[PDB]
Design an enzyme around this catalytic site. Structure first.
Site, PDB file in Angstrom:
ATOM      1  NE  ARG A   1     -51.661  68.576  17.060  1.00 56.70           N
ATOM      2  CZ  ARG A   1     -52.457  69.741  16.718  1.00 56.70           C
ATOM      3  NH1 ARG A   1     -52.884  69.731  15.612  1.00 56.70           N
ATOM      4  NH2 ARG A   1     -52.456  70.532  18.100  1.00 56.70           N
TER       5      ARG A   1
ATOM      6  CG  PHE B   1     -50.462  75.548  13.700  1.00 56.74           C
ATOM      7  CD1 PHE B   1     -50.489  76.513  14.708  1.00 56.74           C
ATOM      8  CD2 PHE B   1     -51.528  74.569  13.705  1.00 56.74           C
ATOM      9  CE1 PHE B   1     -51.620  76.713  15.628  1.00 56.74           C
ATOM     10  CE2 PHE B   1     -52.500  74.499  14.620  1.00 56.74           C
ATOM     11  CZ  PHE B   1     -52.308  75.427  15.621  1.00 56.74           C
TER      12      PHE B   1
ATOM     13  CD  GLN C   1     -49.861  69.678  20.372  1.00 58.89           C
ATOM     14  OE1 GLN C   1     -50.353  69.942  19.579  1.00 58.89           O
ATOM     15  NE2 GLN C   1     -50.672  68.845  21.375  1.00 58.89           N
TER      16      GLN C   1
ATOM     17  CG  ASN D   1     -55.889  73.638  26.838  1.00 58.15           C
ATOM     18  OD1 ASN D   1     -56.348  73.556  25.969  1.00 58.15           O
ATOM     19  ND2 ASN D   1     -55.174  74.957  27.024  1.00 58.15           N
TER      20      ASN D   1
ATOM     21  CG  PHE E   1     -48.338  74.648  21.193  1.00 62.49           C
ATOM     22  CD1 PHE E   1     -49.108  74.428  22.281  1.00 62.49           C
ATOM     23  CD2 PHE E   1     -48.363  75.790  20.340  1.00 62.49           C
ATOM     24  CE1 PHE E   1     -50.018  75.506  22.566  1.00 62.49           C
ATOM     25  CE2 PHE E   1     -49.185  76.901  20.868  1.00 62.49           C
ATOM     26  CZ  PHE E   1     -50.210  76.750  21.916  1.00 62.49           C
TER      27      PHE E   1
ATOM     28  CG  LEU F   1     -53.751  79.157  19.644  1.00 58.81           C
ATOM     29  CD1 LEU F   1     -52.579  78.298  19.649  1.00 58.81           C
ATOM     30  CD2 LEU F   1     -55.029  78.092  19.726  1.00 58.81           C
TER      31      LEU F   1
ATOM     32  CG  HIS G   1     -53.535  76.834  24.021  1.00 57.98           C
ATOM     33  ND1 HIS G   1     -53.360  75.522  24.241  1.00 57.98           N
ATOM     34  CD2 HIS G   1     -54.715  76.986  23.446  1.00 57.98           C
ATOM     35  CE1 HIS G   1     -54.296  74.982  23.601  1.00 57.98           C
ATOM     36  NE2 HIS G   1     -55.265  75.803  23.056  1.00 57.98           N
TER      37      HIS G   1
HETATM   38  C1  LIG Z   1     -51.864  74.092  19.622  1.00 54.35           C
HETATM   39  C2  LIG Z   1     -52.264  73.603  20.654  1.00 54.35           C
HETATM   40  O1  LIG Z   1     -53.542  72.791  20.402  1.00 54.35           O
HETATM   41  C3  LIG Z   1     -53.871  71.808  21.657  1.00 54.35           C
HETATM   42  O2  LIG Z   1     -53.311  72.092  22.907  1.00 54.35           O
HETATM   43  C4  LIG Z   1     -55.138  71.238  21.571  1.00 54.35           C
HETATM   44  N1  LIG Z   1     -54.996  69.674  21.978  1.00 54.35           N
HETATM   45  C5  LIG Z   1     -54.174  68.885  21.783  1.00 54.35           C
HETATM   46  O3  LIG Z   1     -53.220  69.301  20.963  1.00 54.35           O
HETATM   47  N2  LIG Z   1     -53.844  67.974  22.233  1.00 54.35           N
HETATM   48  C6  LIG Z   1     -54.774  67.320  23.229  1.00 54.35           C
HETATM   49  C7  LIG Z   1     -54.061  67.209  24.692  1.00 54.35           C
HETATM   50  C8  LIG Z   1     -53.387  68.305  25.091  1.00 54.35           C
HETATM   51  C9  LIG Z   1     -53.039  68.369  26.417  1.00 54.35           C
HETATM   52  C10 LIG Z   1     -53.263  67.465  27.431  1.00 54.35           C
HETATM   53  N3  LIG Z   1     -52.596  67.526  28.665  1.00 54.35           N
HETATM   54  C11 LIG Z   1     -53.887  66.381  26.948  1.00 54.35           C
HETATM   55  C12 LIG Z   1     -54.341  66.392  25.434  1.00 54.35           C
HETATM   56  C13 LIG Z   1     -52.815  67.057  21.980  1.00 54.35           C
HETATM   57  C14 LIG Z   1     -53.127  66.456  20.663  1.00 54.35           C
HETATM   58  C15 LIG Z   1     -54.288  66.179  19.912  1.00 54.35           C
HETATM   59  N4  LIG Z   1     -53.804  65.641  18.546  1.00 54.35           N
HETATM   60  C16 LIG Z   1     -54.562  65.223  17.698  1.00 54.35           C
HETATM   61  N5  LIG Z   1     -52.296  65.748  18.574  1.00 54.35           N
HETATM   62  N6  LIG Z   1     -51.970  65.939  19.748  1.00 54.35           N
END
Ligand SMILES: CCOC(=O)CNC(=O)N(Cc1ccc(N)cc1)Cc1cn(C)nn1
Length: 165
Positions: free
Chosen positions: A55, A60, A63, A102, A113, A122, A126
């Site tokens: 992602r 932004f 990730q 998370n 990320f 955040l 985070h």
């Molecule tokens: C800017 C940071 O945003 C997040 O961490 C929000 N959660 C997240 O990104 N994820 C969920 C996540 C994060 C960490 C763990 N351990 C499990 C799930 C991963 C994800 C979701 N999508 C649509 N694409 N990537």
């Protein structure tokens, strides 16, 4: 005493792009820093090598770190599936900040990320644990393969990774 440095060698559809190195703030967030370090060396038998940035949202963040499901739903830490928020000492001050993704409080795994903007909203939710040291130019190049909804136009992989020095 010295904060550890780790590198990622980045590829774009398999073609080498360049190296990104990171300082890990082990002096401030040792548990979180050690998880990322260990995942980057692969010394526990699992880790980031070969995984993707699934992602990427220009302006932004980029990730990655989902080595178990490859799409943002997976990953695991060196401590178990999920570990606690260590502290929120460090803030998301600008481009190059390295922070844990998370799914709620105390749900850190392996996903992370790299900020490419200030992401103040955040803060306190985070855990920030490092920063890009060298190769912010490589992060910016990667960022150009993202999109508004985060889907990448080419596959952005961690071809190799490890610890420097
Ligand atoms: C800017 C940071 O945003 C997040 O961490 C929000 N959660 C997240 O990104 N994820 C969920 C996540 C994060 C960490 C763990 N351990 C499990 C799930 C991963 C994800 C979701 N999508 C649509 N694409 N990537």
């Amino acid at each position: 005493m010295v904060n550890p440095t780790v590198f990622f060698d980045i590829a774009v559809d398999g073609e080498p792009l360049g190296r990104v190195s990171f300082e890990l703030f082990a002096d401030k967030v040792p548990k979180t820093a050690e998880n990322f370090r260990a995942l980057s060396t692969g010394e526990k038998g699992f880790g980031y090598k070969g995984s993707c940035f699934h992602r990427i949202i220009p302006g932004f963040m980029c990730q990655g770190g989902d080595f178990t499901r490859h799409n943002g739903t997976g990953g695991k830490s060196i401590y178990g599936e999920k570990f606690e928020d260590e502290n929120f000492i460090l803030k998301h001050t600008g481009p190059g900040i390295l922070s844990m993704a998370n799914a709620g409080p105390n749900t850190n795994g392996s996903q992370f990320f790299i900020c490419t903007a200030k992401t103040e909203w955040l803060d306190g939710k985070h855990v920030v644990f490092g920063k890009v040291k060298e190769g912010m130019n490589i992060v910016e190049a990667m960022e150009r393969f993202g999109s508004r909804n985060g889907k990448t136009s080419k596959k952005i992989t961690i071809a190799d990774c490890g610890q420097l020095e």
